[PDB]
Amino acid sequence: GSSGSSGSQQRVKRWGFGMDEALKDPVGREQFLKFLESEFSSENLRFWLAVEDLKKRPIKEVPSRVQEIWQEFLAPGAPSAINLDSKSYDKTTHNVKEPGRYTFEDAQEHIYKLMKSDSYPRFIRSSAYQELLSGPSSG
């Protein structure tokens, strides 16, 4: 919804519970991400989201993206080039062959199970997250 209501500090806290919540809210998604980019970890998340949306994309932009997403993080010469286990990575590489909607479903799990307690955790440790709670502004 375009419109909202008063009460951001309370909302933020939600994200301090687990990536899950952070994702639900729009601001929490970008906020939590920001910190990632800094630690050059965003790649993990960036890829995740790409998947959730991937399916959303039309059949015309379904396949075209498949390879793309895999060429962004699931690629060797890529910027967000992520890293996955052997058993997992192997399965993915094979799935890629045929572009679909849940082709990268497997990976989504591995990463998700990671970022959840991989990056999210730090977010709480750092202050960037606290900022919102208090109020990131002059005063």
Side-chain angles (χ1 to χ4, degrees):
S2 306
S3 176
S5 290
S6 168
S8 304
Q9 171 179 338
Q10 276 63 97
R11 186 168 296 182
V12 178
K13 198 70 186 150
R14 291 276 202 283
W15 323 324
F17 287 135
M19 191 161 70
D20 276 323
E21 304 292 312
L23 306 158
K24 263 96 100 163
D25 284 286
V27 177
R29 268 191 161 165
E30 83 182 25
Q31 283 304 305
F32 161 65
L33 157 90
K34 301 208 176 165
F35 167 99
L36 307 177
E37 292 179 297
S38 174
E39 62 157 331
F40 299 70
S41 301
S42 63
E43 56 208 335
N44 309 9
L45 172 66
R46 273 209 66 170
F47 162 56
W48 198 70
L49 287 172
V51 178
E52 277 272 317
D53 164 287
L54 176 62
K55 53 200 88 288
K56 305 289 91 208
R57 288 292 91 156
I59 183 70
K60 70 186 77 74
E61 274 200 80
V62 148
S64 293
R65 210 74 151 156
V66 165
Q67 74 190 317
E68 283 289 341
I69 300 158
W70 143 282
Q71 288 207 321
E72 196 79 275
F73 326 73
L74 311 178
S80 312
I82 56 161
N83 191 270
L84 305 154
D85 198 58
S86 188
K87 67 199 279 200
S88 49
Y89 194 77
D90 209 48
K91 200 150 170 89
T92 302
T93 308
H94 207 321
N95 307 351
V96 179
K97 270 66 165 295
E98 48 163 302
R101 294 205 166 142
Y102 312 116
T103 302
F104 303 104
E105 200 156 54
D106 294 323
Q108 197 162 46
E109 161 169 315
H110 206 88
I111 299 304
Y112 167 108
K113 288 144 52 162
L114 162 92
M115 306 179 301
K116 66 178 275 272
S117 273
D118 153 77
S119 283
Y120 152 81
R122 287 187 184 277
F123 205 53
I124 299 89
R125 309 288 289 197
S126 210
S127 198
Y129 152 95
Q130 306 273 5
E131 302 283 85
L132 297 320
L133 279 166
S134 177
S137 279
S138 55

CSV table of all heavy atoms in Angstrom, one decimal, residues 3-46:
chain,number,residue,atom,x,y,z
A,3,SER,N,0.0,4.3,1.0
A,3,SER,CA,-0.2,5.0,2.3
A,3,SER,C,0.2,4.1,3.4
A,3,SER,O,0.2,2.9,3.3
A,3,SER,CB,-1.7,5.5,2.4
A,3,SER,OG,-1.9,6.1,3.7
A,4,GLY,N,0.5,4.8,4.5
A,4,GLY,CA,0.9,4.0,5.7
A,4,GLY,C,0.4,4.6,7.0
A,4,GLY,O,-0.7,5.2,7.0
A,5,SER,N,1.2,4.5,8.1
A,5,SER,CA,0.8,5.0,9.4
A,5,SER,C,2.0,5.3,10.2
A,5,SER,O,3.1,5.0,9.9
A,5,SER,CB,-0.1,4.0,10.1
A,5,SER,OG,-1.4,3.9,9.5
A,6,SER,N,1.8,6.0,11.3
A,6,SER,CA,2.8,6.4,12.2
A,6,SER,C,3.3,5.3,13.1
A,6,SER,O,2.5,4.5,13.6
A,6,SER,CB,2.4,7.6,13.2
A,6,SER,OG,3.3,7.8,14.2
A,7,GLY,N,4.6,5.1,13.2
A,7,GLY,CA,5.2,4.0,13.9
A,7,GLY,C,6.2,3.2,13.2
A,7,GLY,O,5.9,2.1,12.7
A,8,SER,N,7.4,3.7,13.0
A,8,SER,CA,8.5,3.0,12.3
A,8,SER,C,9.4,2.2,13.2
A,8,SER,O,9.7,1.1,12.9
A,8,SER,CB,9.3,4.0,11.5
A,8,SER,OG,8.5,4.8,10.6
A,9,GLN,N,9.7,2.9,14.3
A,9,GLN,CA,10.6,2.2,15.3
A,9,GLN,C,10.1,0.8,15.7
A,9,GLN,O,10.8,-0.2,15.7
A,9,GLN,CB,10.7,3.1,16.6
A,9,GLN,CG,11.4,2.4,17.7
A,9,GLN,CD,11.5,3.3,19.0
A,9,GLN,OE1,11.5,4.5,18.9
A,9,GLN,NE2,11.7,2.6,20.1
A,10,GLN,N,8.8,0.8,16.0
A,10,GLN,CA,8.1,-0.5,16.4
A,10,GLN,C,8.2,-1.5,15.2
A,10,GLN,O,8.5,-2.7,15.5
A,10,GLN,CB,6.7,-0.3,16.8
A,10,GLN,CG,6.5,0.2,18.2
A,10,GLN,CD,7.1,1.5,18.5
A,10,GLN,OE1,6.5,2.5,18.5
A,10,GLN,NE2,8.4,1.5,18.8
A,11,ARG,N,8.0,-1.0,14.0
A,11,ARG,CA,8.0,-1.9,12.8
A,11,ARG,C,9.4,-2.5,12.7
A,11,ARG,O,9.6,-3.7,12.4
A,11,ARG,CB,7.6,-1.1,11.6
A,11,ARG,CG,7.5,-2.0,10.3
A,11,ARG,CD,6.8,-1.2,9.2
A,11,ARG,NE,5.4,-0.9,9.6
A,11,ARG,CZ,4.6,-0.2,8.7
A,11,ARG,NH1,5.0,0.1,7.5
A,11,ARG,NH2,3.4,0.0,9.1
A,12,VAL,N,10.4,-1.6,12.7
A,12,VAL,CA,11.8,-2.0,12.6
A,12,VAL,C,12.1,-3.3,13.4
A,12,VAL,O,12.6,-4.3,12.9
A,12,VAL,CB,12.8,-0.9,12.9
A,12,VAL,CG1,14.2,-1.4,12.8
A,12,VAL,CG2,12.6,0.3,12.1
A,13,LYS,N,11.9,-3.2,14.7
A,13,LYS,CA,12.1,-4.2,15.7
A,13,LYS,C,11.8,-5.6,15.0
A,13,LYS,O,12.6,-6.5,15.1
A,13,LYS,CB,11.3,-4.1,16.9
A,13,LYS,CG,11.8,-4.9,18.1
A,13,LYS,CD,13.1,-4.4,18.6
A,13,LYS,CE,13.7,-5.3,19.7
A,13,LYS,NZ,15.2,-5.3,19.7
A,14,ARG,N,10.6,-5.7,14.4
A,14,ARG,CA,10.2,-6.9,13.7
A,14,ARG,C,11.3,-7.5,13.0
A,14,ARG,O,11.6,-8.7,13.1
A,14,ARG,CB,9.0,-6.6,12.7
A,14,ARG,CG,7.7,-6.2,13.4
A,14,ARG,CD,6.9,-7.4,13.9
A,14,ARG,NE,5.5,-7.1,14.0
A,14,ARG,CZ,5.0,-6.4,15.1
A,14,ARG,NH1,5.9,-6.0,16.1
A,14,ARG,NH2,3.7,-6.2,15.2
A,15,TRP,N,12.1,-6.7,12.2
A,15,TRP,CA,13.2,-7.2,11.4
A,15,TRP,C,14.3,-7.8,12.3
A,15,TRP,O,15.0,-8.7,12.0
A,15,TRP,CB,13.8,-6.1,10.6
A,15,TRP,CG,12.8,-5.2,10.0
A,15,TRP,CD1,11.5,-5.5,9.6
A,15,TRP,CD2,12.9,-3.8,9.8
A,15,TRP,NE1,10.9,-4.4,9.1
A,15,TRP,CE2,11.7,-3.3,9.2
A,15,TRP,CE3,13.9,-2.9,10.0
A,15,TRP,CZ2,11.5,-2.0,8.9
A,15,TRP,CZ3,13.7,-1.5,9.7
A,15,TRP,CH2,12.5,-1.1,9.2
A,16,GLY,N,14.4,-7.3,13.6
A,16,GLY,CA,15.4,-7.7,14.5
A,16,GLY,C,15.0,-9.1,15.0
A,16,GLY,O,15.7,-9.6,15.9
A,17,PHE,N,14.0,-9.7,14.5
A,17,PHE,CA,13.6,-11.0,15.0
A,17,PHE,C,14.1,-12.1,14.0
A,17,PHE,O,14.5,-13.2,14.5
A,17,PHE,CB,12.0,-11.1,15.0
A,17,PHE,CG,11.4,-10.4,16.2
A,17,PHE,CD1,10.3,-9.6,16.0
A,17,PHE,CD2,12.0,-10.5,17.5
A,17,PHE,CE1,9.8,-8.9,17.1
A,17,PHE,CE2,11.5,-9.8,18.5
A,17,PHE,CZ,10.4,-9.0,18.4
A,18,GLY,N,14.0,-11.8,12.7
A,18,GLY,CA,14.5,-12.8,11.7
A,18,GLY,C,14.3,-12.3,10.3
A,18,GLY,O,13.3,-11.7,10.0
A,19,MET,N,15.2,-12.6,9.4
A,19,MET,CA,15.1,-12.2,8.0
A,19,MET,C,13.6,-12.3,7.6
A,19,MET,O,13.1,-11.4,6.9
A,19,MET,CB,15.9,-13.2,7.1
A,19,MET,CG,16.1,-12.7,5.7
A,19,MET,SD,17.5,-13.4,4.9
A,19,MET,CE,16.9,-15.1,4.7
A,20,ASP,N,12.9,-13.4,7.9
A,20,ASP,CA,11.5,-13.6,7.5
A,20,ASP,C,10.8,-12.2,7.6
A,20,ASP,O,10.3,-11.7,6.5
A,20,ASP,CB,10.9,-14.5,8.5
A,20,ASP,CG,11.1,-16.0,8.1
A,20,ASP,OD1,11.1,-16.3,6.9
A,20,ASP,OD2,11.3,-16.8,9.0
A,21,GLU,N,10.7,-11.6,8.8
A,21,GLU,CA,10.0,-10.4,8.9
A,21,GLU,C,10.7,-9.3,8.0
A,21,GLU,O,10.0,-8.6,7.3
A,21,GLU,CB,10.1,-9.9,10.4
A,21,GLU,CG,9.5,-10.9,11.4
A,21,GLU,CD,8.0,-11.1,11.2
A,21,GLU,OE1,7.3,-10.1,11.2
A,21,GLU,OE2,7.6,-12.3,11.2
A,22,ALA,N,12.0,-9.1,8.1
A,22,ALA,CA,12.7,-8.2,7.3
A,22,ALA,C,12.2,-8.2,5.9
A,22,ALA,O,12.1,-7.1,5.2
A,22,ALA,CB,14.2,-8.4,7.4
A,23,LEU,N,12.0,-9.4,5.3
A,23,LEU,CA,11.5,-9.5,4.0
A,23,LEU,C,10.1,-9.0,3.8
A,23,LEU,O,9.8,-8.2,2.9
A,23,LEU,CB,11.5,-11.0,3.6
A,23,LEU,CG,12.9,-11.7,3.8
A,23,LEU,CD1,12.7,-13.2,3.9
A,23,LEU,CD2,13.8,-11.4,2.6
A,24,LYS,N,9.2,-9.4,4.7
A,24,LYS,CA,7.8,-9.0,4.6
A,24,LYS,C,7.7,-7.5,4.3
A,24,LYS,O,7.1,-7.1,3.3
A,24,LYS,CB,7.1,-9.3,6.0
A,24,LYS,CG,6.3,-10.5,6.0
A,24,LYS,CD,7.1,-11.7,6.6
A,24,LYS,CE,6.7,-12.0,8.0
A,24,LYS,NZ,7.2,-13.3,8.5
A,25,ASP,N,8.3,-6.7,5.2
A,25,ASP,CA,8.3,-5.2,5.0
A,25,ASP,C,9.2,-4.8,3.9
A,25,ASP,O,10.3,-5.4,3.7
A,25,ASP,CB,8.7,-4.5,6.3
A,25,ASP,CG,7.6,-4.5,7.3
A,25,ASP,OD1,6.6,-3.7,7.1
A,25,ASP,OD2,7.7,-5.2,8.3
A,26,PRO,N,8.9,-3.8,3.1
A,26,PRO,CA,9.7,-3.3,2.0
A,26,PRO,C,10.9,-2.6,2.4
A,26,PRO,O,12.0,-2.9,2.0
A,26,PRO,CB,8.7,-2.3,1.3
A,26,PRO,CG,7.8,-1.8,2.4
A,26,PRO,CD,7.6,-3.0,3.3
A,27,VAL,N,10.8,-1.7,3.4
A,27,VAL,CA,11.9,-0.9,3.9
A,27,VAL,C,12.9,-1.9,4.6
A,27,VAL,O,14.2,-1.7,4.4
A,27,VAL,CB,11.5,0.1,4.9
A,27,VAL,CG1,12.7,0.8,5.5
A,27,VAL,CG2,10.6,1.1,4.3
A,28,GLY,N,12.4,-2.9,5.3
A,28,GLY,CA,13.3,-3.8,5.9
A,28,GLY,C,14.1,-4.6,5.0
A,28,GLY,O,15.2,-5.1,5.3
A,29,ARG,N,13.6,-4.9,3.8
A,29,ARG,CA,14.3,-5.7,2.8
A,29,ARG,C,15.5,-4.9,2.3
A,29,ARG,O,16.6,-5.5,2.2
A,29,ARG,CB,13.3,-5.9,1.6
A,29,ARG,CG,12.6,-7.3,1.7
A,29,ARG,CD,11.9,-7.6,0.4
A,29,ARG,NE,11.5,-9.1,0.4
A,29,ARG,CZ,10.7,-9.6,-0.5
A,29,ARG,NH1,10.1,-8.8,-1.4
A,29,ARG,NH2,10.4,-10.9,-0.5
A,30,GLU,N,15.3,-3.6,1.9
A,30,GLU,CA,16.4,-2.8,1.4
A,30,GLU,C,17.4,-2.5,2.5
A,30,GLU,O,18.6,-2.6,2.4
A,30,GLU,CB,15.9,-1.5,0.8
A,30,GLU,CG,15.6,-0.4,1.8
A,30,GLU,CD,15.0,0.8,1.2
A,30,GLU,OE1,14.4,0.7,0.1
A,30,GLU,OE2,15.2,1.9,1.7
A,31,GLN,N,16.9,-2.1,3.7
A,31,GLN,CA,17.7,-1.7,4.8
A,31,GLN,C,18.7,-2.9,5.2
A,31,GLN,O,19.9,-2.7,5.2
A,31,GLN,CB,16.8,-1.5,6.1
A,31,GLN,CG,16.1,-0.1,6.0
A,31,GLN,CD,17.1,1.0,5.9
A,31,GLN,OE1,18.0,1.2,6.7
A,31,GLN,NE2,16.9,1.9,4.9
A,32,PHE,N,18.1,-4.0,5.5
A,32,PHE,CA,19.0,-5.2,5.8
A,32,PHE,C,20.0,-5.5,4.7
A,32,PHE,O,21.1,-5.8,5.0
A,32,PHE,CB,18.1,-6.4,6.0
A,32,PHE,CG,18.9,-7.7,5.9
A,32,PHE,CD1,19.9,-8.0,6.8
A,32,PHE,CD2,18.6,-8.6,4.9
A,32,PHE,CE1,20.6,-9.2,6.7
A,32,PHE,CE2,19.3,-9.8,4.8
A,32,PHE,CZ,20.3,-10.1,5.7
A,33,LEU,N,19.6,-5.3,3.4
A,33,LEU,CA,20.4,-5.5,2.3
A,33,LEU,C,21.6,-4.5,2.3
A,33,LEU,O,22.8,-5.0,2.3
A,33,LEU,CB,19.7,-5.3,1.0
A,33,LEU,CG,20.5,-4.9,-0.2
A,33,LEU,CD1,20.9,-6.2,-1.0
A,33,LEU,CD2,19.7,-4.0,-1.2
A,34,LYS,N,21.4,-3.2,2.4
A,34,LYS,CA,22.4,-2.2,2.5
A,34,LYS,C,23.6,-2.8,3.3
A,34,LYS,O,24.7,-2.8,2.7
A,34,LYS,CB,21.9,-1.0,3.2
A,34,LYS,CG,20.7,-0.3,2.5
A,34,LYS,CD,20.6,1.2,2.7
A,34,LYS,CE,19.5,1.8,1.9
A,34,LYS,NZ,19.2,3.2,2.4
A,35,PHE,N,23.4,-3.1,4.5
A,35,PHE,CA,24.5,-3.7,5.3
A,35,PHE,C,25.3,-4.8,4.6
A,35,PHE,O,26.5,-4.8,4.6
A,35,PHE,CB,24.0,-4.2,6.7
A,35,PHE,CG,25.0,-5.0,7.4
A,35,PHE,CD1,25.7,-4.5,8.5
A,35,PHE,CD2,25.2,-6.4,7.1
A,35,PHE,CE1,26.6,-5.2,9.2
A,35,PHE,CE2,26.1,-7.1,7.8
A,35,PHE,CZ,26.8,-6.6,8.8
A,36,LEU,N,24.5,-5.6,3.9
A,36,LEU,CA,25.1,-6.7,3.2
A,36,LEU,C,26.2,-6.2,2.2
A,36,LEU,O,27.4,-6.5,2.3
A,36,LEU,CB,24.1,-7.5,2.5
A,36,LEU,CG,22.9,-8.0,3.3
A,36,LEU,CD1,21.9,-8.7,2.5
A,36,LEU,CD2,23.4,-8.9,4.4
A,37,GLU,N,25.7,-5.4,1.2
A,37,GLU,CA,26.6,-4.9,0.2
A,37,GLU,C,27.9,-4.5,0.8
A,37,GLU,O,29.0,-4.8,0.3
A,37,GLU,CB,25.9,-3.7,-0.5
A,37,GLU,CG,24.7,-4.0,-1.3
A,37,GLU,CD,24.1,-2.8,-2.0
A,37,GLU,OE1,23.6,-2.0,-1.2
A,37,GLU,OE2,24.0,-2.7,-3.2
A,38,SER,N,27.9,-3.8,1.9
A,38,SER,CA,29.1,-3.3,2.6
A,38,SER,C,30.0,-4.5,2.9
A,38,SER,O,31.2,-4.4,2.6
A,38,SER,CB,28.7,-2.6,3.9
A,38,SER,OG,29.9,-2.3,4.7
A,39,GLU,N,29.5,-5.6,3.4
A,39,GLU,CA,30.3,-6.7,3.7
A,39,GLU,C,30.4,-7.6,2.5
A,39,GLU,O,30.9,-8.8,2.6
A,39,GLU,CB,29.7,-7.5,4.9
A,39,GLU,CG,28.3,-8.0,4.6
A,39,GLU,CD,27.9,-9.2,5.5
A,39,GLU,OE1,28.8,-10.0,5.9
A,39,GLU,OE2,26.7,-9.4,5.7
A,40,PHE,N,30.0,-7.1,1.3
A,40,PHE,CA,30.1,-7.9,0.1
A,40,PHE,C,29.4,-9.2,0.2
A,40,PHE,O,29.9,-10.2,-0.3
A,40,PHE,CB,31.6,-8.1,-0.3
A,40,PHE,CG,32.3,-6.8,-0.6
A,40,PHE,CD1,32.6,-5.9,0.5
A,40,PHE,CD2,32.7,-6.4,-1.8
A,40,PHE,CE1,33.3,-4.8,0.3
A,40,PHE,CE2,33.3,-5.2,-2.1
A,40,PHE,CZ,33.7,-4.4,-1.0
A,41,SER,N,28.3,-9.2,0.9
A,41,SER,CA,27.5,-10.4,1.2
A,41,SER,C,26.2,-10.4,0.5
A,41,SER,O,25.6,-11.4,0.1
A,41,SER,CB,27.3,-10.7,2.7
A,41,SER,OG,28.6,-10.8,3.3
A,42,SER,N,25.7,-9.2,0.2
A,42,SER,CA,24.4,-8.9,-0.4
A,42,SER,C,24.1,-10.0,-1.5
A,42,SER,O,23.0,-10.5,-1.6
A,42,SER,CB,24.3,-7.6,-1.0
A,42,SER,OG,25.3,-7.4,-2.1
A,43,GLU,N,25.2,-10.3,-2.3
A,43,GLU,CA,25.1,-11.3,-3.3
A,43,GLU,C,24.1,-12.4,-2.9
A,43,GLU,O,23.3,-12.8,-3.7
A,43,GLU,CB,26.5,-11.9,-3.6
A,43,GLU,CG,27.2,-12.5,-2.4
A,43,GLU,CD,28.7,-12.4,-2.5
A,43,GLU,OE1,29.2,-12.4,-3.7
A,43,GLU,OE2,29.4,-12.4,-1.5
A,44,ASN,N,24.3,-12.9,-1.7
A,44,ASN,CA,23.4,-14.0,-1.2
A,44,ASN,C,22.0,-13.6,-1.3
A,44,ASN,O,21.2,-14.3,-1.9
A,44,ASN,CB,23.8,-14.3,0.3
A,44,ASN,CG,25.3,-14.5,0.5
A,44,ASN,OD1,26.1,-14.3,-0.5
A,44,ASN,ND2,25.7,-15.0,1.6
A,45,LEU,N,21.6,-12.5,-0.7
A,45,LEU,CA,20.2,-12.0,-0.7
A,45,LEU,C,19.8,-11.7,-2.2
A,45,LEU,O,18.8,-12.3,-2.7
A,45,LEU,CB,20.1,-10.8,0.2
A,45,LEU,CG,18.7,-10.1,0.1
A,45,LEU,CD1,17.6,-11.0,0.7
A,45,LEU,CD2,18.8,-8.8,0.8
A,46,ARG,N,20.5,-10.8,-2.8
A,46,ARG,CA,20.2,-10.4,-4.1
A,46,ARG,C,19.7,-11.5,-5.0
A,46,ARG,O,18.7,-11.5,-5.7
A,46,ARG,CB,21.4,-9.7,-4.8
A,46,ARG,CG,21.6,-8.3,-4.6
A,46,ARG,CD,22.3,-7.6,-5.7
A,46,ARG,NE,21.5,-7.6,-6.9
A,46,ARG,CZ,21.8,-6.9,-8.0
A,46,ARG,NH1,22.9,-6.1,-8.0
A,46,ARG,NH2,21.1,-6.9,-9.1
